[PDB]
Amino acid sequence: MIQQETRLKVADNSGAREVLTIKVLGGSGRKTANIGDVIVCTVKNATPGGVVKKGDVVKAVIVRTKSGVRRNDGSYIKFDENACVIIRDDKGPRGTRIFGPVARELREGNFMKIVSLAPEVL
Amino acid sequence: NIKSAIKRVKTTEKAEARNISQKSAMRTAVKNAKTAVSNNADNKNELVSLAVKLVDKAAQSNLIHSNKADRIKSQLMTAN
């Protein structure tokens, strides 16, 4: 489960391609994370252009986890990868697109701008 | 935008289906023909003369047009 020093892909129009998970906001020393859990990340590489750069540090919201979530109907889900999306506590992204489909349980946390964009709510 | 060529679309699709049926019917006839070259009965003349009719039953319309037809006959009316 996503935790400290975990490298992820991304999904948006950033100029960035992967990140690092410093801290996993919540409680009093959480170790873990899953879908929906905001995190504090940084940047370990970059494609050229784009707003963000190396050495930067920003938050993110996890999605496309590889050990997926259990729905209360008793159904599960699993992706292949791990990923995240950049964010500014509008709970609305910086980016303009979202590749790489999304997990819907974000909706409980009242995220809808990225759900406007994601193929598909799943 | 689109104005009128939508006609030529539908027409293009009809003539697509027709033309490929003609061509591929020929091509299978040619396959039979060249494969009949190995054989010894005849079993050749029926097939090869038939296909050399079909080349012309189907050449008058499509893009071939004659020169290449005449090359196909040129090689194929000789191998038997």
Place this chain on the structure above:
Amino acid sequence: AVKIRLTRLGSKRNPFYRIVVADARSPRDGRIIEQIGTYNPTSANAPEIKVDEALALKWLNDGAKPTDTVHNILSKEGIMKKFDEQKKAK
């Protein structure tokens, strides 16, 4: 697809058409094959014209749909009388 036709050459207000043979694919005011004759609808009414009328028949004998505005003046010169006098001859 070959049509003797007109290629206006004057400036703003005083046009001076030219008779010329051409294929219809071309632009009007562009490329041609050979000039013959000419035209001038003013500075004298009736107009001032010339004509080859020697090889102008050549292009008709081997193909043309000569237009009507031309056909009129070729009648005014009357070379078409020789044209049909050979074509509808036989």
Place this chain on the structure above:
Amino acid sequence: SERNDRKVYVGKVVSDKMDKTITVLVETYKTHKLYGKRVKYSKKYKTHDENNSAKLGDIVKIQETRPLSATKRFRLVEIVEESVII
């Protein structure tokens, strides 16, 4: 069609070490626009020999053909003057 007396070019040879083939060096001399003099620059026209008939060092002319291959067009027509050690 019978109109062209083909471009006949004298020359001499530079190789025979390819099949059915030789490599003529036809040469000229041409003037120079700023000045009014003459000067000579060569070329190397490849060729179709029938059966590697003619030799190296030979004195021969050629003629326009049609594209026969990729970067050889010309024929041989007539070797003029053949000899060995000169």
Place this chain on the structure above:
RNA sequence: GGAGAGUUUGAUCCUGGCUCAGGAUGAACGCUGGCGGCGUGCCUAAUACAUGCAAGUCGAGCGAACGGACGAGAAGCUUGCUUCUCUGAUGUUAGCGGCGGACGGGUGAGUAACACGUGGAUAACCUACCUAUAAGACUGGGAUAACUUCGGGAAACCGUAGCUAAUACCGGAUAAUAUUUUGAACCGCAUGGUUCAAAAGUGAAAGACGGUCUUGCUGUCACUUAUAGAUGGAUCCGCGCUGCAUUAGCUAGUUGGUAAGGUAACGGCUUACCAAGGCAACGAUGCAUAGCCGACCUGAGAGGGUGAUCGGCCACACUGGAACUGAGACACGGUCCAGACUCCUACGGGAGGCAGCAGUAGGGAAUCUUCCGCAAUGGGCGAAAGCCUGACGGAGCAACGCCGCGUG
């Protein structure tokens, strides 16, 4: 048809650089301002674009609906209303099908090479329409849109079950230089070419409108086959076509051969094999810059610079790729795919492409009206009338320039 003047020094002649006078701009800026004729107007961000139009046409090929002039029978008597029956002129347009959308208009990101110019070749090619000629124009069938009816679809649009035609589509018959094969003559630039003789091989609309009318006859147009003509296109070739050598080795499908395949055609165009050649100081290669030419500016002239308008050639159409229809496109207002971008959505999914005319933002020192019209010329369809034509005619804005008159 051609002009020199200054300037190093206490003063001189020389060599030597710099500056000035002239002409020219697709030109901007400052000042100023009357008018007409002519000609011009995104040279920058090939940056993104709202709104309008920019390519349809044929009912004299076809089925099918609207329509209602005229004629008329009974009438509820309101004696012109009308129910039907309806006679059916003129006309229309949804659709099928034929030809055009590839021409015409616009721009110059790319491209250093047969791309362009010029001169040649094709015994290595293609060519709808339009002309001329010759021959034909026989005999059959089965479907299907519109139209009825059902369903899924938010919408885009899709499918279901019947039904109908044609210059649609599919067979057969017949048809010569057209393909194989055989032989005689003739010919040459080499492979090969021209003609003659003989065995096998393919088509068409029984079509439409009209006259005579015997509905026969024959006409106009239309279709098919063939041979030419011309037109348009293609490939190859010699030559000329930019700068650096602080760019000197490059290339392996490269170079050559064999065979096959492929294409309108030739060809390493492409596969399988044999081979190691090929190109280069006469500047290969690699590198940055760029559309070219006729022409324009200047100069007495040789020459130097540029490639605005006008015209010829080429490439491109959001970027990139592929292919169908078709005579011709690998298609500027066509598709299919992937991508970036913008947008609609019931979130399942769909839509689009101004470097067409105008116009808007953007950049920039700087480049205009969301104009009238199809009278003319040229286009496209048609039998013609006719219709469409932001090509084009032509009005408007700018002292942008040339020319001209005057402010007595």
Place this chain on the structure above:
RNA sequence: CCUAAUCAGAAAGCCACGGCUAACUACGUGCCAGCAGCCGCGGUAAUACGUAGGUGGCAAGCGUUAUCCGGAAUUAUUGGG
């Protein structure tokens, strides 16, 4: 476009003036403000700055800037050392 009528009433400016270059005098200014294409002006009497007057040029056009050729025989084959 033509024909008749009406009023000199609506309709003129820009640059430069030491030489190169056609085109001079007064004021203010005093190495300050300023000009400049070159050479150079300017420290209390500036023909070179700013103002006036006048003049020359030019014309519904004029000056400056950027670019190109000339002059440049300063890539010189014509035409050098």
Place this chain on the structure above:
RNA sequence: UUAAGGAACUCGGCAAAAUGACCCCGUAACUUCGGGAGAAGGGGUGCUCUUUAGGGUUAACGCCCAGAAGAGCCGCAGUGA
């Protein structure tokens, strides 16, 4: 052996795991020009059938040796340990 993560443990990636054979492509800096260099990185490998190159050995038969080309079959995995 161990899903998710992958040196955060830690004095220190100690140890453990990963790589590992054959052939082919390819292989920088620097250099005492020998090397670096197995650099790196990357690919293929199984059985059957067919066709073919071959070389050594012999009178020849056949006995050995190790390649290429196609075409097929299977399994997640073909130097299957």
